[PDB]
Amino acid sequence: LQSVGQIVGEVLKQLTEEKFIVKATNGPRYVVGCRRQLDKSKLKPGTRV
Amino acid sequence: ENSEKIKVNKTLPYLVSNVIELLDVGKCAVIKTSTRQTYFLPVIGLVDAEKLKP
Amino acid sequence: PAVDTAEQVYISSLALLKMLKHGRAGVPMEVMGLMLGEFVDDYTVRVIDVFAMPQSGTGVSVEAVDPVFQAKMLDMLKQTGRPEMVVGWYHSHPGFGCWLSGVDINTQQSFEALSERAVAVVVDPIQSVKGKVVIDAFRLINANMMVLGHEPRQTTSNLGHLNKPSIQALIHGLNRHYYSITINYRKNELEQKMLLNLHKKSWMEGLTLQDYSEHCKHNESVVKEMLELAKNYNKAVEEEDKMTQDPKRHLEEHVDVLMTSNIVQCLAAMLDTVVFK
Amino acid sequence: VLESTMVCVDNSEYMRNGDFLPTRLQAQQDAVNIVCHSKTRSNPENNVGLITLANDCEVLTTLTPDTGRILSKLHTVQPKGKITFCTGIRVAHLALKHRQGKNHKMRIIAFVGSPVEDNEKDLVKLAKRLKKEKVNVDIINFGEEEVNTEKLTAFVNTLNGKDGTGSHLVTVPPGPSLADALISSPILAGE
Amino acid sequence: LNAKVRLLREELQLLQEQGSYVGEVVRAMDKKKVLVKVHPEGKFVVDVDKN
Amino acid sequence: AVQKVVVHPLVLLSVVDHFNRIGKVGNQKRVVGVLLGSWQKKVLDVSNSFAVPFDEDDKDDSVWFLDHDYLENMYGMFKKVNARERIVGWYHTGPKLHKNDIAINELMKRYCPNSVLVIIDVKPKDLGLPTEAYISVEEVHDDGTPTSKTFEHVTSEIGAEEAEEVGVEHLLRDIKDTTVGTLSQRITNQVHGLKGLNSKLLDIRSYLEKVATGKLPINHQIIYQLQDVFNLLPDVSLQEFVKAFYLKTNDQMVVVYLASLIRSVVALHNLINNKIANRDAEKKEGQ
Amino acid sequence: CTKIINADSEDPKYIINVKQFAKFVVDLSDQVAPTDIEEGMRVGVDRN
Amino acid sequence: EFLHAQEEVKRIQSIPLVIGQFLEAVDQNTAIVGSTTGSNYYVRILSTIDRELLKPNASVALHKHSNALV
Amino acid sequence: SLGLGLAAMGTARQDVYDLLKTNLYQDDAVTGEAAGLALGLVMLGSKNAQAIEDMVGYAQETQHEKILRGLAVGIALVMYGRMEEADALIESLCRDKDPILRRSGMYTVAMAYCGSGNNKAIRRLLHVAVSDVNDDVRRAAVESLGFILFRTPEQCPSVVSLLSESYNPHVRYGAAMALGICCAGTGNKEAINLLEPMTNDPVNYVRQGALIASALIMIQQTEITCPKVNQFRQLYSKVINDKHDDVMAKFGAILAQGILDAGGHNVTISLQ
Amino acid sequence: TRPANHRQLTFEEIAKSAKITVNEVELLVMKALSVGLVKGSIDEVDKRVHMTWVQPRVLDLQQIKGMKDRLEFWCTDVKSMEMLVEHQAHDILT
Ligand SMILES: [Zn+2]
């Protein structure tokens, strides 16, 4: 009951290590940070997050 | 007491939505809210996980 | 009697931190809680601590107080050694401003009926970006007083003013139904030192050396940039003095960074060579 | 009579002694159940907690008005280690002081069947101290009577002082039934 | 130094102030009122400021 | 086991407030509470805490009354408020341990298998963090010595949620330092580093004094680590190192020289402009 | 109201189809005639 | 205090910004943008965002709340 | 309590002091503020060790910021006219962690080194005007600076020209009020030159302070004596007759008129 | 025993130590490094061995008194350098 859902989006541009352009499905495009433990190189243009 | 609290927290005005995609990691969801929106749920919630077919 | 524009709500460090934690730990759902505090004489509302309320689903209202939980945990806090009354309530408004809506007004009216000093505080975690705490206290204006032409709150001193009311609160009726109380923070020296411990640097990082290859690369990069700015500044001085700024300013910034970095590392190396043998 | 009681229970190895049918463990379980129920029936506002006397003392249940939880938490008590009576009693006094309801008399009934290996001087000092803080330490002796009877008499005499019926000693060398011995005892008679 | 600090602070204030919509004036109906259509939502009649 | 524990500003403030209120109502050397947090690998995140009623006989040193019922009730209500915070340990605001710490950790291990003590010193120091973390490990000493159930130190750190960082920064806005290296502050940081190194070396020397005289026994892990430290001390008189050191110092000094030359030329330009402006102003005033 | 969810006898739990906005599962409120609801009857619904 | 103000500006040039298309420059330190949300705003430009590079119809990040081009 | 303190100002009557002590020994802001201020007025100059001890102890032990303010002004008045005998108390109050008590320390500096131009006190106040964190204490420090320098009116504008151009509005207001106290009933020219731009500020209370200081300075001044008095009279009239002018700016203008025409053009303000 | 200043052990030194002629000190050091007892290298052209590590072991009270003396010296040096830096930069310390 205390688990707020996320919003699915797609990576687009692969900015600097800590910056990713992500387009939210049926929504706008943001520049977002990545969770530390999530680890990187698994988020390439088109990847679902 | 626990069931009463769950009943109070399941206040009626739900948002009718789909279960477009179902994943595992426990189970998850990629529900499609009828507000033309898509929401990933890491925890399905109160539902019984009755196979919740896509 | 008339409450004057001098009353202050003193939100303790622990109270404020708990408020912000609860807000950002339950966004977007409207989180709520009680204020274990104390009215001292007439101008003080000391919110010693806060008291989270379980998410009741039915938004924020009197229905979400869950009085049994209130009484049980208040009794047990008293057992712990925290005997404070409930001076009002707090509830978040995640991103849509810091004011009161109709349900908020009804709840605060109920709290005033319990005791006509309770303050309703609102925290907006979404716009509470680090460096700016958008929190605001409120109390309702009796419907009779405003129509009677008398001001909602007395004004006996210059304290209480110096606060610019928010446009959002105005358009939602800041002074027509309630009024914003001034929020003060009671910061103890021990608490401040504990807070400093958060980002306090370690003596290691104080005495450590930057990677030497990276240092050389940075020096070379900045010196090349400063070369380019030197050419630009030469052309700028020549042209301005022949026909009679950004180049000079950027060059000053680059020289400053170069000097500070190089001197710091040189001294750190000297200290290491001496101290570690 | 608004009462706050602490039932100290020995779970030392000597509870493996089987003089009381079927075992000393089951006998003490029945006795504690009976005494707790007797305390609760009279003025249910009374509250009862429970202490385990093992290699190191423990408090299984603080002062509560319920008895089923105390029974349930005692049922899983097994015989182990050795008794530390002084520490058990001090923990009981601390629990009494921390009891939520300050409008209760202070009682501690101790199933202490064991040879109490403690020094007589500090023993009498503890008894007098408890008398000073106005405690009533009732003591149920079933076991090494020949060893601990004089010390238990010291307990109760020092606690009573003069006309101090608060603290009592009940010794049961015979083993017909611990529960029946307790129910037909002065401690429960006044309730 | 005072001028520099004041400039930065004023920039901070004016930049953290909320943005503003852009609309197309259908017709300056009435004084102090302007029928304006704001993209993409409907069209309002705004009360123009005194500046 | 747990390799790291990160305590939070909210936990620190709550502990300080608990100690203050208890010492205001009465007098006690320690105050005790439960630490609530979550695990992410072997990195405990102590994100909350709550006090529990607790008193002991400071003379007996083995009689105490930690309230398990109060503990479980508060834990249940904190579960109701927030769910991703399970009991992960306990804390006591005592500068030093006591014989009761092992017993209370045994008590807490019933609520958490990996129960961790966190001593949060309300008295504010100046070199290290206010939190010391301990995990109770009892294992047959490969040393071959008698084994007793005792604590073992756990690496501790202070971290903050973003919603706690905002509050911390706001509370410290008046006495905050710049989040940038200004030359004066960097030199000050180096001086503080020397201070910390000296204090740590003094502590090690005092421990060596005590163990050598005989007051304390030889701790083999301590001696191993000290041996490794002395092995790790560099050699700065080596010619091959002195030459590289002088080379790097000369490179840094030439960069500094170029910087200072540029700065002096800029200052001269500024003064030329000022002299010209003064000339213009005085000529205009005269005419 | 595109589906009365069978009315589950008691606890109706009506469904609504606010056009261009969303679908919802809602109930009545001070509806003095909880029977005159039908399906597709174009009911009025609050905002919050 | 000057260092603090600089740090505050560097901060408001934050991470969670919103993408949008800078449409044109109205005046100095102010311009019109169209955010990917689908709405057009008259926002304020921060200082030193290379107005030379800031050409019409350019991808730019916007402050999530004030929509300022940062 | 206020009336009795005013009536017994400087008398140091033991009975009045003890009655005021009893009235102060409660938990109530309205009574405690007056009780403390009247204690200060009664003990003024006496340097009574008992008075200082009792007032500081109650200030430290109380919980009402209003009582704290009253006791702050009271201690300041108590340690009046004592040039160097006030330094121990000044150091104690300045090092105290209660911001109201630090303000009390600023006021103690002012009262002790009143009208002496003591450079040590000026240095202390100027240091606290920029090092301290509490804007209240900064403003009190600037006011104390004016109180110290009132004897040499030409001297103060040199100090306060820079303070008036401060990014801290509280320090700006303190600068204005310090100029007012220093050049009260003097009608200096550079002081008015500094006040006028401050009279035109975007901050609310800086304008009030500037207006009141200008009234203090130009009290009993004619157009010929100061060719700006008519200008400030027009300014006061304009600010009073305005739509958006802030409440406190209007308050300051109204006061300014009152002081400027104080006593029916028959009384001036001079501290000596 | 050898301090980090002159940890350059020599073939002749190892010969005067555990009895072996200098034609297999090389093999002995190879065995030590391979087992992991020590770390470093062997410059047999100059006939010396560079040690940059040792496997720590358990020590005696006198072996710890020596460490205490070495610390004493290190603490003295650190304190002297601290005082020098603090006094020199006194006017710019924040
Ligand atoms: Zn609300």
PDB file of all heavy atoms in Angstrom, chain J residues 6-28:
ATOM      1  N   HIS J   6      66.099   1.766   4.348  1.00  0.00           N
ATOM      2  CA  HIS J   6      67.134   0.954   3.715  1.00  0.00           C
ATOM      3  C   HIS J   6      66.731  -0.512   3.717  1.00  0.00           C
ATOM      4  O   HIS J   6      67.463  -1.390   4.178  1.00  0.00           O
ATOM      5  CB  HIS J   6      68.490   1.150   4.388  1.00  0.00           C
ATOM      6  CG  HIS J   6      68.493   0.865   5.855  1.00  0.00           C
ATOM      7  ND1 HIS J   6      68.766  -0.385   6.367  1.00  0.00           N
ATOM      8  CD2 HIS J   6      68.273   1.670   6.920  1.00  0.00           C
ATOM      9  CE1 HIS J   6      68.709  -0.338   7.686  1.00  0.00           C
ATOM     10  NE2 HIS J   6      68.408   0.896   8.048  1.00  0.00           N
ATOM     11  N   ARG J   7      65.536  -0.792   3.207  1.00  0.00           N
ATOM     12  CA  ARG J   7      65.061  -2.159   3.037  1.00  0.00           C
ATOM     13  C   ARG J   7      65.713  -2.870   1.856  1.00  0.00           C
ATOM     14  O   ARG J   7      65.232  -3.932   1.449  1.00  0.00           O
ATOM     15  CB  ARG J   7      63.541  -2.166   2.863  1.00  0.00           C
ATOM     16  CG  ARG J   7      62.797  -2.584   4.108  1.00  0.00           C
ATOM     17  CD  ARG J   7      61.307  -2.655   3.876  1.00  0.00           C
ATOM     18  NE  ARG J   7      60.590  -2.772   5.138  1.00  0.00           N
ATOM     19  CZ  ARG J   7      59.305  -3.074   5.247  1.00  0.00           C
ATOM     20  NH1 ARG J   7      58.550  -3.288   4.182  1.00  0.00           N
ATOM     21  NH2 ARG J   7      58.762  -3.160   6.456  1.00  0.00           N
ATOM     22  N   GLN J   8      66.786  -2.315   1.300  1.00  0.00           N
ATOM     23  CA  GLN J   8      67.523  -2.952   0.210  1.00  0.00           C
ATOM     24  C   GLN J   8      68.428  -4.022   0.807  1.00  0.00           C
ATOM     25  O   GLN J   8      69.583  -3.772   1.150  1.00  0.00           O
ATOM     26  CB  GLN J   8      68.324  -1.919  -0.570  1.00  0.00           C
ATOM     27  CG  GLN J   8      67.481  -1.010  -1.446  1.00  0.00           C
ATOM     28  CD  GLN J   8      66.831  -1.750  -2.594  1.00  0.00           C
ATOM     29  OE1 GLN J   8      67.239  -2.856  -2.942  1.00  0.00           O
ATOM     30  NE2 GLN J   8      65.814  -1.142  -3.188  1.00  0.00           N
ATOM     31  N   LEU J   9      67.891  -5.229   0.938  1.00  0.00           N
ATOM     32  CA  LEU J   9      68.682  -6.349   1.425  1.00  0.00           C
ATOM     33  C   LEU J   9      69.684  -6.781   0.364  1.00  0.00           C
ATOM     34  O   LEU J   9      69.419  -6.709  -0.838  1.00  0.00           O
ATOM     35  CB  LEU J   9      67.777  -7.524   1.794  1.00  0.00           C
ATOM     36  CG  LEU J   9      66.494  -7.194   2.555  1.00  0.00           C
ATOM     37  CD1 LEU J   9      65.617  -8.421   2.656  1.00  0.00           C
ATOM     38  CD2 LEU J   9      66.818  -6.657   3.932  1.00  0.00           C
ATOM     39  N   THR J  10      70.845  -7.241   0.817  1.00  0.00           N
ATOM     40  CA  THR J  10      71.924  -7.631  -0.075  1.00  0.00           C
ATOM     41  C   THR J  10      72.147  -9.136  -0.028  1.00  0.00           C
ATOM     42  O   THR J  10      71.831  -9.815   0.956  1.00  0.00           O
ATOM     43  CB  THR J  10      73.224  -6.907   0.283  1.00  0.00           C
ATOM     44  OG1 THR J  10      73.664  -7.317   1.582  1.00  0.00           O
ATOM     45  CG2 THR J  10      73.018  -5.405   0.274  1.00  0.00           C
ATOM     46  N   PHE J  11      72.705  -9.653  -1.124  1.00  0.00           N
ATOM     47  CA  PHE J  11      73.025 -11.073  -1.193  1.00  0.00           C
ATOM     48  C   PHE J  11      74.017 -11.453  -0.105  1.00  0.00           C
ATOM     49  O   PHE J  11      73.892 -12.512   0.519  1.00  0.00           O
ATOM     50  CB  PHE J  11      73.590 -11.413  -2.570  1.00  0.00           C
ATOM     51  CG  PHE J  11      72.544 -11.564  -3.640  1.00  0.00           C
ATOM     52  CD1 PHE J  11      71.358 -10.855  -3.584  1.00  0.00           C
ATOM     53  CD2 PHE J  11      72.757 -12.412  -4.711  1.00  0.00           C
ATOM     54  CE1 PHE J  11      70.406 -10.995  -4.570  1.00  0.00           C
ATOM     55  CE2 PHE J  11      71.807 -12.554  -5.699  1.00  0.00           C
ATOM     56  CZ  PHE J  11      70.633 -11.844  -5.628  1.00  0.00           C
ATOM     57  N   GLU J  12      75.011 -10.599   0.138  1.00  0.00           N
ATOM     58  CA  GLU J  12      75.974 -10.871   1.199  1.00  0.00           C
ATOM     59  C   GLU J  12      75.297 -10.877   2.564  1.00  0.00           C
ATOM     60  O   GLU J  12      75.642 -11.687   3.435  1.00  0.00           O
ATOM     61  CB  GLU J  12      77.095  -9.833   1.154  1.00  0.00           C
ATOM     62  CG  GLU J  12      78.278 -10.144   2.056  1.00  0.00           C
ATOM     63  CD  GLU J  12      78.062  -9.700   3.490  1.00  0.00           C
ATOM     64  OE1 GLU J  12      77.315  -8.723   3.709  1.00  0.00           O
ATOM     65  OE2 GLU J  12      78.653 -10.322   4.396  1.00  0.00           O
ATOM     66  N   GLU J  13      74.334  -9.976   2.775  1.00  0.00           N
ATOM     67  CA  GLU J  13      73.591  -9.969   4.031  1.00  0.00           C
ATOM     68  C   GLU J  13      72.832 -11.275   4.221  1.00  0.00           C
ATOM     69  O   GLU J  13      72.878 -11.884   5.295  1.00  0.00           O
ATOM     70  CB  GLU J  13      72.624  -8.787   4.066  1.00  0.00           C
ATOM     71  CG  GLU J  13      73.249  -7.483   4.521  1.00  0.00           C
ATOM     72  CD  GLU J  13      72.267  -6.331   4.477  1.00  0.00           C
ATOM     73  OE1 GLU J  13      71.089  -6.571   4.137  1.00  0.00           O
ATOM     74  OE2 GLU J  13      72.672  -5.189   4.775  1.00  0.00           O
ATOM     75  N   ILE J  14      72.126 -11.723   3.182  1.00  0.00           N
ATOM     76  CA  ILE J  14      71.368 -12.963   3.317  1.00  0.00           C
ATOM     77  C   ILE J  14      72.307 -14.154   3.464  1.00  0.00           C
ATOM     78  O   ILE J  14      71.934 -15.177   4.046  1.00  0.00           O
ATOM     79  CB  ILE J  14      70.412 -13.141   2.126  1.00  0.00           C
ATOM     80  CG1 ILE J  14      69.262 -12.141   2.223  1.00  0.00           C
ATOM     81  CG2 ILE J  14      69.860 -14.551   2.102  1.00  0.00           C
ATOM     82  CD1 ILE J  14      68.648 -11.793   0.891  1.00  0.00           C
ATOM     83  N   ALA J  15      73.526 -14.053   2.937  1.00  0.00           N
ATOM     84  CA  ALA J  15      74.506 -15.115   3.141  1.00  0.00           C
ATOM     85  C   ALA J  15      74.961 -15.167   4.594  1.00  0.00           C
ATOM     86  O   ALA J  15      74.998 -16.241   5.206  1.00  0.00           O
ATOM     87  CB  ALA J  15      75.699 -14.910   2.210  1.00  0.00           C
ATOM     88  N   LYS J  16      75.322 -14.013   5.162  1.00  0.00           N
ATOM     89  CA  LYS J  16      75.687 -13.973   6.577  1.00  0.00           C
ATOM     90  C   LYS J  16      74.522 -14.408   7.456  1.00  0.00           C
ATOM     91  O   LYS J  16      74.731 -14.907   8.568  1.00  0.00           O
ATOM     92  CB  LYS J  16      76.151 -12.570   6.966  1.00  0.00           C
ATOM     93  CG  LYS J  16      77.450 -12.134   6.307  1.00  0.00           C
ATOM     94  CD  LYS J  16      78.614 -13.036   6.687  1.00  0.00           C
ATOM     95  CE  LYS J  16      79.006 -13.953   5.538  1.00  0.00           C
ATOM     96  NZ  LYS J  16      80.140 -14.850   5.893  1.00  0.00           N
ATOM     97  N   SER J  17      73.297 -14.223   6.974  1.00  0.00           N
ATOM     98  CA  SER J  17      72.109 -14.803   7.586  1.00  0.00           C
ATOM     99  C   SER J  17      72.040 -16.268   7.177  1.00  0.00           C
ATOM    100  O   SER J  17      73.064 -16.839   6.790  1.00  0.00           O
ATOM    101  CB  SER J  17      70.854 -14.037   7.176  1.00  0.00           C
ATOM    102  OG  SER J  17      70.951 -12.686   7.586  1.00  0.00           O
ATOM    103  N   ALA J  18      70.860 -16.888   7.282  1.00  0.00           N
ATOM    104  CA  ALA J  18      70.716 -18.335   7.138  1.00  0.00           C
ATOM    105  C   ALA J  18      71.721 -18.906   6.146  1.00  0.00           C
ATOM    106  O   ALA J  18      71.831 -18.430   5.013  1.00  0.00           O
ATOM    107  CB  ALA J  18      69.296 -18.676   6.689  1.00  0.00           C
ATOM    108  N   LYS J  19      72.455 -19.933   6.571  1.00  0.00           N
ATOM    109  CA  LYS J  19      73.707 -20.312   5.923  1.00  0.00           C
ATOM    110  C   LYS J  19      73.449 -20.803   4.505  1.00  0.00           C
ATOM    111  O   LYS J  19      72.956 -21.917   4.305  1.00  0.00           O
ATOM    112  CB  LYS J  19      74.421 -21.385   6.741  1.00  0.00           C
ATOM    113  CG  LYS J  19      74.444 -21.133   8.240  1.00  0.00           C
ATOM    114  CD  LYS J  19      74.937 -19.733   8.565  1.00  0.00           C
ATOM    115  CE  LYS J  19      75.244 -19.588  10.046  1.00  0.00           C
ATOM    116  NZ  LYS J  19      75.603 -18.191  10.409  1.00  0.00           N
ATOM    117  N   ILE J  20      73.802 -19.977   3.524  1.00  0.00           N
ATOM    118  CA  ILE J  20      73.843 -20.384   2.124  1.00  0.00           C
ATOM    119  C   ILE J  20      74.832 -19.477   1.410  1.00  0.00           C
ATOM    120  O   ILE J  20      74.918 -18.280   1.699  1.00  0.00           O
ATOM    121  CB  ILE J  20      72.444 -20.324   1.462  1.00  0.00           C
ATOM    122  CG1 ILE J  20      71.761 -18.992   1.767  1.00  0.00           C
ATOM    123  CG2 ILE J  20      71.576 -21.479   1.921  1.00  0.00           C
ATOM    124  CD1 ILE J  20      70.425 -18.830   1.083  1.00  0.00           C
ATOM    125  N   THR J  21      75.583 -20.055   0.479  1.00  0.00           N
ATOM    126  CA  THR J  21      76.436 -19.256  -0.385  1.00  0.00           C
ATOM    127  C   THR J  21      75.572 -18.416  -1.319  1.00  0.00           C
ATOM    128  O   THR J  21      74.380 -18.677  -1.502  1.00  0.00           O
ATOM    129  CB  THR J  21      77.371 -20.148  -1.201  1.00  0.00           C
ATOM    130  OG1 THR J  21      78.291 -19.332  -1.935  1.00  0.00           O
ATOM    131  CG2 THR J  21      76.578 -21.011  -2.173  1.00  0.00           C
ATOM    132  N   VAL J  22      76.177 -17.394  -1.915  1.00  0.00           N
ATOM    133  CA  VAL J  22      75.431 -16.497  -2.813  1.00  0.00           C
ATOM    134  C   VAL J  22      75.501 -17.133  -4.195  1.00  0.00           C
ATOM    135  O   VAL J  22      76.230 -16.708  -5.093  1.00  0.00           O
ATOM    136  CB  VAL J  22      75.972 -15.063  -2.783  1.00  0.00           C
ATOM    137  CG1 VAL J  22      75.810 -14.468  -1.396  1.00  0.00           C
ATOM    138  CG2 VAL J  22      77.434 -15.015  -3.220  1.00  0.00           C
ATOM    139  N   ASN J  23      74.710 -18.189  -4.367  1.00  0.00           N
ATOM    140  CA  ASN J  23      74.264 -18.644  -5.674  1.00  0.00           C
ATOM    141  C   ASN J  23      72.845 -19.185  -5.620  1.00  0.00           C
ATOM    142  O   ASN J  23      72.330 -19.623  -6.653  1.00  0.00           O
ATOM    143  CB  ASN J  23      75.204 -19.723  -6.232  1.00  0.00           C
ATOM    144  CG  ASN J  23      76.602 -19.202  -6.485  1.00  0.00           C
ATOM    145  OD1 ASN J  23      76.801 -18.293  -7.292  1.00  0.00           O
ATOM    146  ND2 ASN J  23      77.583 -19.778  -5.801  1.00  0.00           N
ATOM    147  N   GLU J  24      72.204 -19.170  -4.450  1.00  0.00           N
ATOM    148  CA  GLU J  24      70.835 -19.633  -4.298  1.00  0.00           C
ATOM    149  C   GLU J  24      70.016 -18.743  -3.377  1.00  0.00           C
ATOM    150  O   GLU J  24      68.860 -19.077  -3.093  1.00  0.00           O
ATOM    151  CB  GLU J  24      70.814 -21.086  -3.784  1.00  0.00           C
ATOM    152  CG  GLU J  24      71.243 -21.273  -2.332  1.00  0.00           C
ATOM    153  CD  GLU J  24      72.713 -21.616  -2.204  1.00  0.00           C
ATOM    154  OE1 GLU J  24      73.554 -20.808  -2.648  1.00  0.00           O
ATOM    155  OE2 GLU J  24      73.029 -22.695  -1.660  1.00  0.00           O
ATOM    156  N   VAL J  25      70.574 -17.631  -2.892  1.00  0.00           N
ATOM    157  CA  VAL J  25      69.741 -16.604  -2.281  1.00  0.00           C
ATOM    158  C   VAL J  25      68.668 -16.183  -3.264  1.00  0.00           C
ATOM    159  O   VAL J  25      67.543 -15.848  -2.876  1.00  0.00           O
ATOM    160  CB  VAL J  25      70.597 -15.401  -1.844  1.00  0.00           C
ATOM    161  CG1 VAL J  25      69.713 -14.310  -1.269  1.00  0.00           C
ATOM    162  CG2 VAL J  25      71.654 -15.831  -0.847  1.00  0.00           C
ATOM    163  N   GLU J  26      69.001 -16.201  -4.554  1.00  0.00           N
ATOM    164  CA  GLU J  26      68.023 -15.910  -5.591  1.00  0.00           C
ATOM    165  C   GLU J  26      66.841 -16.866  -5.510  1.00  0.00           C
ATOM    166  O   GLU J  26      65.684 -16.437  -5.464  1.00  0.00           O
ATOM    167  CB  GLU J  26      68.703 -16.003  -6.952  1.00  0.00           C
ATOM    168  CG  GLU J  26      68.084 -15.154  -8.020  1.00  0.00           C
ATOM    169  CD  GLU J  26      69.043 -14.891  -9.155  1.00  0.00           C
ATOM    170  OE1 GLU J  26      69.808 -15.808  -9.515  1.00  0.00           O
ATOM    171  OE2 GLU J  26      69.026 -13.767  -9.694  1.00  0.00           O
ATOM    172  N   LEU J  27      67.118 -18.172  -5.475  1.00  0.00           N
ATOM    173  CA  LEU J  27      66.043 -19.157  -5.403  1.00  0.00           C
ATOM    174  C   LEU J  27      65.265 -19.028  -4.101  1.00  0.00           C
ATOM    175  O   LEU J  27      64.039 -19.184  -4.082  1.00  0.00           O
ATOM    176  CB  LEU J  27      66.615 -20.568  -5.540  1.00  0.00           C
ATOM    177  CG  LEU J  27      66.876 -21.097  -6.954  1.00  0.00           C
ATOM    178  CD1 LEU J  27      65.587 -21.155  -7.760  1.00  0.00           C
ATOM    179  CD2 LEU J  27      67.918 -20.253  -7.668  1.00  0.00           C
ATOM    180  N   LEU J  28      65.964 -18.760  -2.998  1.00  0.00           N
ATOM    181  CA  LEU J  28      65.284 -18.603  -1.716  1.00  0.00           C
ATOM    182  C   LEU J  28      64.306 -17.435  -1.758  1.00  0.00           C
ATOM    183  O   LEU J  28      63.163 -17.548  -1.295  1.00  0.00           O
ATOM    184  CB  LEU J  28      66.316 -18.407  -0.606  1.00  0.00           C
ATOM    185  CG  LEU J  28      65.823 -17.868   0.737  1.00  0.00           C
ATOM    186  CD1 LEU J  28      64.710 -18.737   1.278  1.00  0.00           C
ATOM    187  CD2 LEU J  28      66.969 -17.791   1.727  1.00  0.00           C
TER     188      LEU J  28
END
